[PDB]
Design a protein around this ligand. Structure first.
Ligand SMILES: [Ca+2]
Length: 257
């Protein structure tokens, strides 16, 4: 048992609709990994699989740098799904994750929801419908049937999952959250409590891994996932780029022995 602390795209295998974007002038870094490129009739689907499994007997702390597309919540990406599973990126490409109503079984994780999916009953309850980069953050469980259900709670004073995933700011160094700019998603797990917490957009959420359907005596794949209009056979209309800087991200955990 030795924790490792790692940074960089070389610790990930990319699968599906992912590439490198060199010198994104709108984001202020050397490069990002970019989700939701090209055009397909059944939409776009991508994952990064961390090359090591995570031992859930031990704590982890991740800091993932993500920028959401500056796009309406019906032409852009479905969101971010930070997903823990025994399932792997190839099965994710075929089966889906945590950004709709169905995906990979007995899995769970944290979503930044950036796409209003008219077929999604979850998007209705969370009032995602409307103009104005309307989104929400939540932990999601996929049960033994692959059905996606929100779990855990928002634990900010505000006690809502709603967040604006982008804005029209021309003053992005003003100290405030600009969701179209790179921002920290902090995912922290403490083995001795079973608590997983997500921090993003100044907001905080918490669940137990038992409420995610995961177990402390197991090692899991970790997938950074995105999808754009995936499964709506409405094709792709627009740029839906969901971009992450893996070099400026940092992952501390105990890999599977
Ligand atoms: Ca949604």
């Amino acid at each position: 048992s030795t924790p490792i602390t790692i940074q960089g795209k070389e610790h990930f295998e990319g699968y599906g609709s992912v590439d490198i974007q060199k010198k994104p002038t709108d984001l202020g870094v050397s490069e990002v990994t970019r989700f939701n490129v090209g055009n397909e009739s059944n939409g776009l689907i991508g994952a990064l699989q961390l090359k090591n499994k995570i031992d859930f007997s031990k704590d982890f702390n991740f800091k993932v740098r993500v920028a959401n597309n500056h796009q309406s919540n019906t032409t852009g990406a479905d969101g971010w799904g930070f997903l823990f599973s025994k399932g792997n990126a190839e099965e994710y490409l075929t089966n889906g994750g945590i950004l709709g109503d169905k995906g990979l079984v007995n899995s769970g994780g944290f979503k930044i929801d950036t796409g209003y999916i008219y077929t999604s009953s979850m998007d209705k309850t969370e009032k995602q419908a409307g103009q104005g980069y309307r989104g929400y953050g939540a932990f999601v469980k996929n049960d033994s049937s692959g059905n996606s259900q929100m779990v855990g709670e928002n634990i900010d004073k505000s006690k809502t999952n709603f967040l604006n995933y982008a804005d029209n700011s021309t003053n992005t160094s003003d100290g405030k959250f600009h969701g179209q700019r790179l921002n920290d998603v902090i995912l922290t797990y403490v083995a001795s409590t079973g608590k997983m917490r997500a921090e993003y957009a100044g907001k905080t959420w918490e669940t137990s891994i038992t409420d995610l359907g995961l177990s402390k005596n197991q090692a899991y794949n970790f997938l950074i996932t995105s999808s754009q209009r995936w499964g709506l056979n409405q094709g792709i209309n627009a740029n839906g780029w969901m971009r992450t800087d893996l070099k400026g991200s940092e992952f501390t955990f105990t890999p599977e022995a």
